[model samples]
Target chain A: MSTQGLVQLLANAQCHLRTSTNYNGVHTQFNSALNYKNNGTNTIDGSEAWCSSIVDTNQYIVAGCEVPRTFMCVALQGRGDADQWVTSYKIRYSLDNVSWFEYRNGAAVTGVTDRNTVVNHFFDTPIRARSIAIHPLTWNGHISLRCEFYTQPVQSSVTQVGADIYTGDNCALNTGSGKREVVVPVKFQFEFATLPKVALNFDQIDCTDATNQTRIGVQPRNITTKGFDCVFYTWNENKVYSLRADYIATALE
Target chain B: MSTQGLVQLLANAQCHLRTSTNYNGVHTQFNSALNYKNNGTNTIDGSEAWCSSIVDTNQYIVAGCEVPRTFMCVALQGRGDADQWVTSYKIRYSLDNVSWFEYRNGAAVTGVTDRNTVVNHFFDTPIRARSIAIHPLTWNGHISLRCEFYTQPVQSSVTQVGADIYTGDNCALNTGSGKREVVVPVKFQFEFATLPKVALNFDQIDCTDATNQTRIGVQPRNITTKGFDCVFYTWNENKVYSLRADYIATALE
Candidate 1:
């Protein structure tokens, strides 16, 4: 589909740079994080890019949206002089700047190669947050870059409900009748307007397997508008040391 | 770049559903696969979705276009009622339906997620194909799904080229002077109109290492409009059992 419905959230005049100590502390207009917005300038000179204060520390820039928005992709450009550009970076998002979640499971995303070429990277899963932080990891000469965020508004008629659930030793509820099976229940954070259709799959599987027949399956049970139980069951007597599963629940009006 | 040039190839009235024993066969208006198009109705009680007559088998649906189109993403919804939806699916495409290529390197992509969420999954590498197939691997109540293909037309002034090459025992050519290096040539399927900027990276790597010093690097050699050689060299005598590398070539006129 065309990006007709997608909005450049950073292009909003109300969307400004976060200036708290945790974000971009102090900056002038020339080298400010505000340049990261979708202004007319595509080419970046030394003054047109956001340069980090420190050399290689965990310095980052935060873009604060006026309201929470759903983001899909990010477009980035390097500082177009003296090979000063970010080589790789990681992303973090926060609804209130207190509770933050790392994008892509905290993996470093590859950044721009050249100084002027714009590279767009789409998130594996979209996120909704008010504050977005870009942390530069490796760079060529200096950590300098420009960026724009792409937001896709959720359809007005549909309500999206999903979460990334990590299962550990604490997740085990009880043993099944066979004694070879274990059940784990997953709960939703918010109540749905209707009995939503839910789909679940494993993002990562870590189990203590001794019989080599360990199998995992998830099914929705005890369906309700409030929440449904995502019962994770295993056929073999294998202890799930750690497991990560994602579920998408959709409630249609 | 914005998807300003993207067009829904399947939305064309001429872009009809493929009909052969391999594809949709003996279909009426009540159960036609043509409902998979972007017609209207977001709700799918029964007749709005393309349902397979079979129960739990590998049935598929295909859409054909008049000319080659580059696909970036696909949007899908499920049959709204009776708990009918596609849980997981794999994609395949072809210039002609005779020679098909599996999308995502034959990995089954997560589908629908729910009945009416309108889930969209972007391809890792956009594919140019005239025919696209949706293979249902697992499903909810029945193999019923409605889909719309999203096409991204390449820029008029740019020629995009890329390929996924698999390196195996046959990829080894001759040893270097140190007898530790092996060179492998990766040729493009078609020549570029101009000298393209190419980027290469490893998708998968399998090597037989005794010292665990086996490494691989790919760089453009003998750069030309026709093709370039991708050389695979190593310091240790470790042999690469199998490796998969992908490259994207972009040429601007």
Candidate 2:
């Protein structure tokens, strides 16, 4: 499926700026991160911020921040005391900021920020896209890592761009014969309207960092209040019941 | 919901001779610091050693040890894992042991040292099931901590007891309303029987003891392996997707 300008798995970041500060704190990391990973430069470096742990991959590191400043003492808070955080992101592309694809065929990702957690996003695509802009929905944290780019696969000629809904979580519903596997996609569709009452979880998870510790779950701030405006979704997110399959080492020790 | 029995949330040295020793480096002050807000002796101190985290009212202090001894050089030299050093405890009556049940039930946990996690068994009717023999699971890293606990609606007639099922994992799938919530128990029941590959993610979590970083997960050595197991997990043996609904605070923070 060699499409001309398709951003196959606009993969997550690879290199992480773990020790960076503002580090926007938590949720704002993705604002600049996604921008850098998608594009070739760090555009959101000098701006406000937000971060995300949910994505199509666990390889690339995505974070966002404003090109300028928002404000301090803005009561940066999550939903509740559940050990997870959420801000927002708005990806904007501009060969010059004029022609944008904020809502066209491209997708938006919403990252969850849990403190001291490793954000790994891995997505590969056979095609090549021109440019991308990863902006924040709100100002939250800072970008502390670098986004890594790699080559990933895509669906056959028919559904070349979209994800392979071929399997639910743990591949419970899919029946791929013999090991000709289907590369599933984790998708995120952003809506201007508030998100409905739904559950939230992690996307890019990395525990290799010795200090990596996270409370993976939905933020309680919006609890009993209202759902989020943007919905953080993914293809791998829909893990159905009875599909709790462990990526267990099948080979003998 | 009127069940009569002993309810112990944190149990320490239930015996006088079962004291803390240097055999394992785990200084579980079970016989000293354990306290309770529920009825009966909430905290007990016997000869056996255990540590109780001084947490908030609803917080939990779980202890993970190799049945009796912590994994050390002793197990390295092929000494004893769960067999030579393990012991079991069977309370005639408990409320907390039986998850989904009230803490009152676990009070009389009928636990065994199955070369793995502490399998605390609880009962419904009144019986004389005190402390049973502790078997060695293996030379697993015997470590425990006091951070957070799960919280959900009334499941086992016990407050915050059965709620442990859902640790507010934003990614988990759940249905139903209050009192009727249906959570698919997602813990890898075969956790001790295989080499699992899972990812955990979070956005915002708690870390009160920032100095002594809390563990996110760990490797299992309760059973003799052909080689060295990877200590990839952290202090809070939490698998991101396993959690469905309650609190992240208890698991990571």
Candidate 3:
């Protein structure tokens, strides 16, 4: 019934999530669990409460708690200061841990708080995934409070095409030693409009991050794929990926 | 009322918004007039069904014959190929859109098929903001989509941080622009033990996306700040922005 019990359930569940072993070319890149909380006596923006101390972004401690059932967070003032800095996010929640999809990630609309602590339930579920995640990027730096898991299973994978999303050979091919898998625009190709907004998940692959003192040492958003510049890996030796590109496009026929 | 009538009402309310002329930049964008008879056909996925093209990612475009209420879109997708890639989006509908608290976006997410064409709505509102306008960078491709006011007071002038929105800035947004008005980052920078598992928001600012390309567009989602790069100005409007040295770790009083 508690968050930990739910964690145990998830810890044992067998779910195939295709994430990178590295994020932004950083090994040990943790996938972001999405949520911002503030359980202190002060407001988040009015004062500098806490931040990722070295390798500790969302790893905040609350005196006596192990990832609260619902952590309270505060988004910084958007007018004077911005906090979390993610461009887009995919918030999803799970119950059976095996079957998520009751609540997937949400897109930010127009009016969000600058310093309002959000009570995150992304990790709270009698079973698992009672709430959604809050993935933040540089889109508008709003502070992220915590990270938790509430898998959304039933949710459909990426499937659509419009001049909306990015789908192509985006990663530049670096044949060097320490700087491989750098997604720095390799070929200016993709003889089409915008990649469909549909989700075309890259299967488990091999990759490496350029950094050693990053989120792996610290608490960072856990990415799904492993950017292998020859350091990190998402799927172990047991897994073999053959670049199986799957989309609802006509090419599949 | 009919979908046409609802479109008319949204279109009629645009003259009621607080308009602005002078902004911090050169591009002068406007809002939407909240409605349309989007029986408009777009190149849908797989089966090539009909979809209302150019719907704002943040805005909704609902369709129905019964009591017209907003609905939740299941997912948005796109596709690609070798010769000519085409992409479009498909959405599911709900009698009520506000019920999303229980079923978040992609909450009850299903697959994007060709046979599924009930109605189309971005989210729940007609004047919702879109995240970004994808822009194409190379010649091997082309782009589509643009921002415009349709019927109601569309999500043009965004005041709220992360609600239906669209805006951008350049990394070089120095003090020639207002400090607070230039670019602001929002909340918390948590601790490790205290790092709550959550995602942060990073709304894009100052994007040079005119082609409405895919890889270069922004989307609507919560993001976090990654330490901003702001330049200050002296008592005088100096020709150049103050170097990084002019900044500080000044906490809010």
Candidate 4:
């Protein structure tokens, strides 16, 4: 993986994207959506931004790639030369040009406040599509923008697991020698190809006594590709009412 | 600079970081502070995140790099699977790890609202530091996070300039000719390595008569490495009160 752990999908050299707009076909080389690509030499200038023929809410721009790609984030900048920029906007994605889906669950992503500063917004979930559209909701002076999309990194065949675990009153009873123990079996949502790395954090913990040297500990035992045992124990006489934890599992490709 | 225009400083492959925490030496391989690296195969499970042993305001996780690095932004994720995430947090940096400085000028950055969404925060000014810490102000369940630092892109020694200019009363005088002209000289804060590309935007403009034929124009002239001239003019002899413009300069390495 690269140092930033993310990939930019748009570049002028690759020429991988075809640009279009909803405005009445009024664009030139200096003010077209094709200039949105970041080619390392891109400058913040009028010639490098996509400016609308007229400033209105109905203006939008579309970028179509050769194949479907998964995008995780987008960086936006306004026209560097004349107080022209998007203040708020929404994103739409499509597998085919005929059908489209809005990036739902969140309000319109906040856009740039100035002409040159780059503002980045991340999606709630990665979107896979061949065509993506940017619709401006509000803008400053004009609906002009420069943009770049961030794609997901190439990961090998890896399995990821996320879930919550709860150890209830089972840990309240003393097994022997005044020691309390409870073994909770956790099964992976999907079996891993190999023994995966696991991490855990306490979400909620409760005990009957507040001041009686209440001690509780958890350890993983018998870890395998399919499941593992979470052993909860306490050497003190205090009773553990309940304990809850969240676990994440990731396996190699 | 890779496609992301940023760099990552902490990686397990390089062994360039030393991890430390305020929660004592209660960490193991499965839940230590050293696993925050974003290796290609790193999983979302417990072993890859830094989890504080205790949930409180004093808990913090620190990563000390072998050398000082210039960082521009940070990406953060909560513990996966369970409702464990940071709501708001502050960042601090140190050169010697003993004397520290908080990331001021802005309020505490908004953190992950959920467990899986990667929340990114950009700094107003890039920070140079050998050590950095994440201090959670509010959290959903516990203070646990997986984080990656983004550094500034290495320029071939490029120069950037930003400023505002005004063409005040000069355009109001119709110097013996029906047309009026004003040339505003803009000096660079620092000389560029080469002739920089310039962009400008209208911040404010005014004309004496709103109903008359008031036409105005601006063009850059004699652009150079140290400065440039902005020519503002009007053809209809309309009383031009004042015109304000903002310009940005970026020079190639």
Note each model's CA RMSD in angstroms. 27.5, 30.1, 29.9, 33.8
lDDT of 1 by residue, A127-218 (tens): 76656777888888877777778776522222333665665653462233232323456666777676665545455665543333333445
C-alpha positional error of residue A163 in candidate 4 after TM-score superposition, expressed in Å: 44
Kindly report the root-mean-square deviation of model 3 from the true structure over all alpha carbons. 29.9
Selected candidate, larger DockQ, 2 vs 4: 2
Alpha-carbon local distance difference test for all models? 0.56, 0.24, 0.23, 0.58
User: Tens digits of per-residue lDDT for model 1 on B1-253?
Assistant: 2334455433322144542222122121123322332213322112346677665546777776644677887767786443678888889889866898998777888887676777777788888888888888888877777676777532322233343455554356223323443445656555544467765555334344435344555566776766777655554554444554555555542
Where is model 2 more than 4 Å wrong at Cα? A1-85, A88-136, A142-253, B1-108, B114-122, B125-253
How do the residues B1-253 of candidate 2 rate in per-residue lDDT, one tens digit apiece?
1212223212332121121111111323222222221222432221222321221122122222111111110011111122321232212211111111223433322323333233323233322211111222222233121111111111110001112332344332122112211123333322223322222223343222223322222222222212222222222333233222221111100
Measure candidate 1: CA RMSD: 27.5
Candidate 4 chain B lDDT trough over 10 residues, lowest sum = B20-29
The worst-scoring run of ten residues by lDDT in candidate 1 chain B lies at B21-30
Which candidate number has the best DockQ? 2
lDDT of 4 by residue, A160-222 (tens): 333346676445543333666688898865565457776554433444442435465666778
iRMSD, per candidate, in listed order: 26.2, 31.2, 27.7, 31.5
TM per candidate = 0.28, 0.16, 0.16, 0.28
Comparing to the true complex, what docking class would candidate 1 get? incorrect
